[PDB]
Structure 1
């Protein structure tokens, strides 16, 4: 009947480039790996099983396709698709000076036929109040208006939005809250003069 051909390990060159053999992630093929590798708990007086017909070497997620020789070759080709970070934004303090708004977003990757994660719609917008144009009266009203979202020690304002289904709608809604909270802190309405001496922050 049909016979078994000798494995290609014998015909493998000594100095051949490994990444050409495994371009993508593939399971451990005993014939395609020149390395004699043994794993499995040995018998009372014996040696661990060979690399042919062994399931223990098949369960493991191999890293033969990410060899350090291949990593340098892979990454260097990707260097075209990049742009440098501006040198003037070296210190983190300067980043706040030139960009006072930071926005946190999350993306989730999981194994399955679906990518829809309801936890990926959250948007966290944090603004340092010292970089805005609030007056003495306007800043005091904004703190009294936003409530617990403002930290008195770090002077940071955190706005978290979850109602919009998409991250782009939440991002547009989050920035909408920031601008309407600022245009409202400057409207000294008539009833504001009815301040009580127990409501004063100082």
Structure 2
């Protein structure tokens, strides 16, 4: 019911047709759900009010509480197919500096991993993406990290000389 005029003028007059125009259809189309309907949908979505902890931002205390930082996203798919080979992303970005409980494992972990171990903040991000899923990938990564820590607790005999 909105006779909106759409079209480029000819010379010195008024845009073209009145009702449905080709341009109007070419628009991504957002006529549905007006601000009133938007407020209605927002009042409907008002549910789900889960609390969140105030662990102080700055990317410091958040990692101190839990050093691991897994990424479990949910991209949007295209076309009529939902199979989107993109939900398997996973990285075990655990802050080793937050741990800080390595007596002799400092000389072991520095060598047991190549492209890791920084200077300011130890970002132990062992990209563990071997299995064809995400949650079990993270589980296997945590298990491997625990096994490595348990093995480093009793360092070898020739690990001192480097």
User: TM-score range with shorter-chain normalisation?
Assistant: 0.7 to 0.9
The offset of 1:133, in angstroms, is 4.5
2:154 to 187, 193, 200: 187
Asked which structure has the greater CA Rg, the reply is 1
TM norm structure 1: 0.68
Indicate conservation of the 8 Å contact 2:105/2:153, yes or no: yes
Deviations 1:41-67 (A, max 9, x none): 221233212342421111212222343
In 1, the alpha carbon distance for the partners of 2:3 and 2:138 equals 54
Deviations 1:126-173 (A, max 9, x none): 111122143242122111111112222322111212221112222222
Deviations 1:6-44 (A, max 9, x none): xxxxxxxxxxxxxxxxxxxxxxxxxxxx32311222212
Q: Which has the higher contact order (CA 8 A, sep 6+)?
A: 2
Q: Which runs of 5+ in 2 are unaligned?
A: none
Distance 1:36 1:102, change over 3 A: same
Indicate conservation of the 8 Å contact 1:121/1:166, yes or no: yes
The offset of 1:90, in angstroms, is 6.4
In 1, the alpha carbon distance for the partners of 2:18 and 2:117 equals 61
Aligned length: 162
Indicate conservation of the 8 Å contact 2:5/2:18, yes or no: yes
In 1, the alpha carbon distance for the partners of 2:161 and 2:99 equals 27
Moved over 6 A (4+): none
In 2, the alpha carbon distance for the partners of 1:105 and 1:166 equals 11
TM norm structure 2: 0.83
In 1, the alpha carbon distance for the partners of 2:86 and 2:40 equals 36
Q: Which runs of 5+ in 1 are unaligned?
A: 1-33, 196-202
SS in 1 for 2:107: helix
Indicate conservation of the 8 Å contact 1:122/1:162, yes or no: yes
Greater share of helix: 1
